[model samples]
Structure formats: C-alpha cells, structure tokens
Target: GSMSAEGYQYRALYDYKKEREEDIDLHLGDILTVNKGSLVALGFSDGQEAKPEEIGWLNGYNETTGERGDFPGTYVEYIGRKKISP
Candidate 1:
C-alpha cells in the first residue's frame, strides 16, 4: 500500500494481524472469504504497476511521511480476473 488507497483495496482471502508496535498494530491480510464478503478482510492494494523494485518487500499501504516496510513477494500472487468457478 501507499500514502493513498488509489489502489490495493483487496478483499482479503487470508488472515493476518499486524504485529507492529502496540500503537501501530492493526488487522491485515486475507481471511479466505471467512471475512471477504463481510468486509472483514477488506484491505488495500488491488494491483501493482510498473517498477523495477516492485517484486521485493515494500510498503503497500498507509503511511504518513511514507509508511515504509518490506513485504514478501510470496505474500502476493497475481490471479487477475480469470473467473474461477466457486
């Protein structure tokens, strides 16, 4: 995510609680539909754009001066809108 939610507003499919400082800690990641439809897994970052350092860990959301952080590449998998039967 970035300073703006211009993108990355995803319906989380996995569950993750931010283990950041107590003051900064917050809920994050996908909950695998256990929360998606309910808006519980509602997170930012729907897609990524052109950049050389796009693959490695980097902040994808919420920052004041610049919410800097290294996110794992494995954490995000691009499936696009292929329409997988549920």
Candidate 2:
C-alpha cells in the first residue's frame, strides 16, 4: 500500500497514530490535504526533528487536528484534487 499519490485530497485508510513525535495522527476516514513542494521538501527537517526512514510518506494538513506533518501514503486513499481539472 506504499504508493505515491497524484492528488490533493486523501482519506485515511487506517488509524495512523504517531509512532514517533514527528508525525501527525490520522484517524480512519479523516480527510488530509496534501501540501507537498513548499514545506515538505524545503522545510522537511523544520517540520519534524528527524527524517522518516522511508518513502511514500508525505506532508499533509489535517483539518480536525489543525496541524501539518508527515503521514504515511500507504495509510491514505487518493481522493483527488480540490481545484484544477485533469
């Protein structure tokens, strides 16, 4: 289930409670909005104290939590972009 996603909106496929202090929690079916490019790659270390030793993880915004941090791409299902047409 570790796959790269192309969309902006994604729903959690599982409850991804943080295994470490650097990650954001994702409860089942919670919607997470992707915020790649800007903060994810540039301020990757700024967001999290340490790096996740894995790929397919991404930086996202969780509305309920009102926080942004890394979450497993494997734990979310693609829900497509909020704007722009394909």
Candidate 3:
C-alpha cells in the first residue's frame, strides 16, 4: 500500500532514535536521500524550515555522486516536537 504523508511522518518518528544513532550502517547522505524520497513518495515536500543538516546531507550526496559507501560525519540530531497544553 502507498503510505500517506502522515504515515511517513509516523514512520519517521518511529524510526527517529535509530536514525540518529552514530553507528548506523548507512551513510547519512544516502539515508537523507532515501528519507526525502520516502517523503516525496508519500506526497509531502519539505518546507522552507528544513534543517541545515538535511541540506548538508543532500549536498554531500550530490557532491559525491559515484561514491561507493556511506559518508561519515553526516548524522544529524533529532529534535522532537513538544505539545503545548492550553
């Protein structure tokens, strides 16, 4: 089944901690590319507020188009949303 935008968001959240791990098997750049693709496939475009880390990851992937392996120093910290009570 095709995942909706909300579903992707939920997946992102569910995968957040694992995604932030420093020893992740995949390259940060590759991960971001796949993540962005996942988001687009689910019908959501990153808004202007997209983080600098994401931009850096995309740039790194673009800069090293034919690289065979994951690029190090590409992991970004995950910041979660807080609910405000009225």
Candidate 4:
C-alpha cells in the first residue's frame, strides 16, 4: 500500500541541553508513534498549522534510521491512546 503524504512541523525554540548521539536505529512504527503522540500533546490536527519542512526532515530522518516504508503522515492523525504499527 502507498503511504500517506501528510505531515507536521515544529521548531526548536530552545538550545540543545544535551548531546548524546549513538546508533539508536528506530523502526517506522516507533517513529510514527512518537511523532503522532507529540502532535496530540501539542493540540494540533491533521492539515492544520504544521510546517512542511519539519515534516520532510522527520521523514528523511526516519528513512535514514532504517524505518523505510510508506509515509506515516502527520502526528495529529497518527497520535492516539493506542499503539501504532508500521
């Protein structure tokens, strides 16, 4: 099946408080879950005020992290009180 092309974007208003970079390869399912949950917590919705660039970066990050698959779309639509799957 084809992945959704929807997505959301947010800016980092604060500086990096910590720096810990390791090979923590994430799965597509996990990435979608986190991002979707974050959007819900932020009170956003699908096709809302989300940044396209931020969404693109997130997609790229996921792809590079070995979570290649269909697009998971925006966090708002994906976020819920249930576990997400790839």
The number of the candidate with the highest lDDT is: 2
lDDT of 4 at 3: 54
Could you give candidate 1's per-residue lDDT for residues 44-83 as a string of tens digits? 2533322314555333433432332334434444332212
lDDT of 2 by residue, 1-86 (tens): 53754335777777767887789777876887664434445344443312233435777688877988877667777666523333
RMSD of each: 12.3, 9.0, 13.4, 11.5
Scored by Cα lDDT, where does model 2 land? 0.62
Tens digits of lDDT, candidate 4, 1-86: 33543343222222222122422333333433224345554344553333443443233234334433233233313232322322
* TM-score for all models, in order of appearance: 0.27, 0.61, 0.18, 0.21
Each model's lDDT: 0.32, 0.62, 0.29, 0.34
Q: Model 3: which residue pairs collide?
A: none
Model 3 regions more than 4 Å off: 1-42, 52-62, 68-74, 77-86
Q: Please give the distance, in angstroms, between residue 3's alpha carbon in candidate 2 and its true position after superposition.
A: 29
| Alpha-carbon lDDT of model 4 | 0.34
Please, what are the lDDT tens digits per residue for candidate 3 over residues 2-86? 3322111100111222244333333233323223334443243654223534443322122233422223323443332212111
Measured by TM-score, the strongest candidate is 2
Q: Give the runs in model 1 whose Cα sits over 4 Å from its true position.
A: 1-11, 20-54, 62-70, 78-86
lDDT head-to-head 2 vs 3, winner: 2
Give residue 43's lDDT in candidate 4 (0 to 100): 48
